[PDB]
Ligand binder design. Structure first.
Ligand SMILES: Nc1ncnc2c1ncn2[C@@H]1O[C@H](COP(=O)(O)OP(=O)(O)OP(=O)(O)O)[C@@H](O)[C@H]1O
Ligand SMILES: [Ca+2]
Lengths: 362, 140
């Protein structure tokens, strides 16, 4: 079909874009725009960094630079998906706490710059929650630049209670790069950081008890894993495996004022009506690439249980597809024939304006 | 957000009877391929038989007439239940049951004037004990 609905999950680190009906995004590239010191997006912008000023148009999940964001969307439609956006309805995702004026701006750019026939805006956390198989719960979304605790009640996020931790995979890669660089193995360039990111995604894990795991690593090599570098050399990492994602629970490891993701979860729940706290405690849904660590659901489980009231059932839901649960959720939505009457059409926008997105999408 | 699937005439007629207190239990399911909400079960159900109605392998919608006392009053409280047993449900099944929930609840209020006192979500039927139903409706 030349008019297949599109799904674009705009993340602060990566853009996951594809077609409605598919199981995974067809395009996954960096949210980076490079302008001369006319513009470059993604991998090529990073490559030509010697003659460009690189920028992240999505600061902590929020789109802050729209001239740059238009470059990402242009690259998404023509270079990644290889489609004409004037013939495809486009489902877009938004961050928790995304300003209403920002949501309006996104709609206007889709309709006036790209001339899309129809569009939809959904909150990332709510799509992950829905695809998990529930409508009330608290979501821990940890991606590339930001981590959020989002309490959602019947499909509506509670803005007052949403917690934002400006620490995610980007920082953990940097931290592993520094902790590897200081024990011999020196990684410096953007490509060497990509090797580190790969070590981190393949070998890192969350310890159930950090100080106990530090002790196990100090007295034996039971927790050591090896990694073959591109040149053929074999490196062996020990406590770096869990010290790196431990930063999520102890952000003081990288000089941060914000308490760990278990405490910000507790704080987020404590900001909501006592009557719904039990429903939040029993439905902690994980989503995002930085929630892929083995052992993280077990660790969040014991940490929430140590803070929560003893008469709360604490449940952590960590779907195996959570690295792409936002994109997959939108893909299922936009692929429905009954979804045809949910889209904001170009005609409805021309009559009402961009404030239609608050009514038709929410 | 909210996706409105058509409701079968049967399912609508059973909900109409449940709103008029002629039935005390209506279980609905989504026919995933046809994008429709259909009738699954309407057996006479007292609170003690309720745990044994909830499937173990698939997600469901349930309307239940919860008859109980609360501070000297006798209440016949219609409760909504979204059961989701877990990873036995595909991502598509999980997404459709979550997305279709609000529109189904709005149609039931707008057309049948059903007074859903609470919307409950459970992993399994064995949770629906008398104390649990009481704590959901009256959380104090
Ligand atoms: N298996 C894994 N283990 C740990 N981290 C991983 C894994 N897979 C991906 N990541 C990390 O997750 C991040 C990407 O996740 P995600 O796509 O959800 O981010 P994003 O949407 O771009 O960012 P955000 O949600 O913060 O705005 C990267 O930092 C990546 O290294
Ligand atoms: Ca994201």
């Amino acid at each position: 079909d030349e008019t297949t609905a599109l799904v674009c999950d705009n993340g602060s680190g990566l853009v996951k874009a594809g077609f409605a009906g598919d199981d995974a995004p067809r395009a996954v590239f960096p949210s980076i725009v490079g302008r001369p010191r006319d513009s470059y997006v993604g991998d090529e912008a990073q490559s030509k960094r010697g003659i460009l000023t690189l920028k992240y148009p999505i600061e902590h999940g929020i789109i802050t630079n729209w001239d740059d964001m238009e470059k990402i969307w242009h690259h998404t439609f023509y270079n990644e998906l290889r489609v004409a956006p004037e013939e495809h309805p486009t489902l877009l995702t938004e961050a928790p706490l995304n300003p209403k004026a920002n949501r309006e701006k996104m709609t206007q750019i889709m309709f006036e710059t790209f001339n899309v026939p129809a569009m939809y805006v959904a909150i990332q956390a709510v799509l992950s929650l829905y695809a998990s198989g529930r409508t009330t719960g608290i979501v821990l979304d940890s991606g590339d630049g930001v981590t959020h605790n989002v309490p959602i009640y019947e499909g509506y996020a509670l803005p007052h209670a949403i917690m934002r931790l400006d620490l995610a995979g980007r920082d953990l890669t940097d931290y592993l790069m520094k902790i590897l660089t200081e024990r011999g193995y020196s990684f410096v360039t953007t490509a060497e950081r990509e090797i580190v990111r790969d070590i981190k995604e393949k070998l890192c894990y969350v310890a159930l008890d950090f100080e106990n795991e530090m002790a196990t690593a100090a007295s034996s090599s039971s927790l050591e894993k090896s990694y073959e570098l591109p040149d053929g050399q074999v490196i062996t990492i020990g406590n770096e495996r869990f010290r790196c994602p431990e930063t999520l629970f102890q952000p003081s490891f990288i000089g941060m004022e914000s308490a760990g993701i278990h405490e910000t979860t507790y704080n987020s729940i404590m900001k909501c009506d006592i009557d719904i706290r039990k429903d939040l405690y029993a439905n902690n849904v994980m989503s995002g690439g930085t929630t892929m660590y083995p052992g993280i659901a077990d660790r969040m489980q014991k940490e929430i249980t140590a803070l929560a009231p003893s008469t709360m059932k604490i449940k952590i839901i960590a779907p195996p597809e959570r690295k792409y649960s936002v994109w997959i959720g939108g893909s299922i939505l936009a692929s429905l024939s009954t979804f045809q009457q949910m889209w904001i059409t170009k005609q409805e926008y021309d009559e009402a304006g961009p404030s239609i997105v608050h009514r038709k999408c929410f | 957000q909210g996706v409105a699937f058509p409701i079968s005439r049967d399912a609508f007629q059973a909900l109409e009877k449940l709103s008029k207190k002629q039935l005390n239990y209506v279980q609905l399911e989504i026919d995933i391929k046809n994008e429709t909400i259909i009738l699954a079960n309407t057996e006479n159900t007292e609170l003690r038989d309720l745990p044994k109605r909830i499937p173990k392998d698939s997600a469901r919608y349930h309307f239940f007439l919860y008859k109980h006392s609360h501070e000297g009053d006798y209440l016949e409280s219609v409760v909504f239940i979204y059961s989701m047993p877990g990873y036995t449900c595909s991502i598509r099944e999980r997404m459709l049951y979550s997305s279709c929930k609000s529109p189904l609840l709005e149609i039931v209020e707008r057309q049948l004037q059903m007074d859903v006192i609470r919307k409950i979500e459970i992993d399994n039927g064995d949770e629906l004990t008398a104390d649990f139903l009481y704590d959901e409706v009256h959380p104090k």
